[PDB]
Amino acid sequence: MIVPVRCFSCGKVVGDKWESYLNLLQEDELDEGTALSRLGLKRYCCRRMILTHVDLIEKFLRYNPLEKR
Amino acid sequence: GLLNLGVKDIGEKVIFDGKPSGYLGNKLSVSVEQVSIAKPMSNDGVSSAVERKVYPSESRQRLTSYRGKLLLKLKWSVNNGEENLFEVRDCGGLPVMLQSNRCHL
Amino acid sequence: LKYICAECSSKLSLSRTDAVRCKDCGHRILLKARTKRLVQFEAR
Numbered sequence: 001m002i003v004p005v006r007c008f009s010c011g012k013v014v015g016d017k018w019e020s021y022l023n024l025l026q027e028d029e030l031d032e033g034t035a036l037s038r039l040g041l042k043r044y045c046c047r048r049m050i051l052t053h054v055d056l057i058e059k060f061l062r063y064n065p066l067e068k069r
Numbered sequence: 070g071l072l073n074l075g076v077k078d079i080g081e082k083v084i085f086d087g088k089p090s091g092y093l094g095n096k097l098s099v100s101v102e103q104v105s106i107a108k109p110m111s112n113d114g115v116s117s118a119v120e121r122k123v124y125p126s127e128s129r130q131r132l133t134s135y136r137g138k139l140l141l142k143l144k145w146s147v148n149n150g151e152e153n154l155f156e157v158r159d160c161g162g163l164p165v166m167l168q169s170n171r172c173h174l
Numbered sequence: 175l176k177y178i179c180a181e182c183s184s185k186l187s188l189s190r191t192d193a194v195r196c197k198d199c200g201h202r203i204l205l206k207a208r209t210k211r212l213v214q215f216e217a218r
């Protein structure tokens with residue numbers, strides 16, 4: 001679902017970096033490794049959290065029971 | 070279709086009544102020549118008019134089955150074509166399966 | 175105004191001896207709406 005706030009292994013806050021990672025991937029032609037390095041994720045424990053996130057929340061939000069379809 | 074081939078190869082089942090008519094009175098030859106399943110629809114009570122469209126989400130939420138009507142026309146044949154009485158008879162709601170041609174998705 | 179239709183998502187309300195159906199369409203499934211009520215939790 002939505003991006004976890006903190007990295008599991010150590011505790012570094014990665015919940016403010018998903019949108020930045022997506023912007024760095026989309027606007028600039030940065031590889032995932034370079035984008036993660038620019039975001040400040042040096043350890044692979046922190047790197048995996050943003051590199052392997054799925055973001056199922058966007059798929060979940062398409063089913064809204066309080067708005068006419 | 071397989072259903073149409075099945076009813077075609079079933080054949081006609083024949084009965085007699087005692088009304089003196091060489092064997093026993095007149096002859097009855099009941100058969101089926103067309104089986105049709107329709108996509109599920111909802112009567113919405115008794116309003117009818119244009120029938121509503123049921124969906125698997127509605128079936129799951131209602132905790133009921135997702136079935137469409139089954140239609141059969143009986144070839145009520147008397148004395149080998151002397152007098153034929155066609156009549157389409159519904160046979161309840163046949164449970165239809167999702168993403169098939171008889172489903173709304 | 176405590177119910178929401180399950181197909182057109184229109185808010186409505188019910189009364190005694192009232193049909194369980196939408197007032198704008200024929201759907202007979204009404205999701206219960208979430209109201210404002212204190213629900214204490216723990217951030218653990």
Ligand SMILES: [Zn+2]
Binds near residue numbers: 011
């Ligand atoms: Zn970490």
Ligand SMILES: [Zn+2]
Binds near residue numbers: 179196197200
């Ligand atoms: Zn409605």
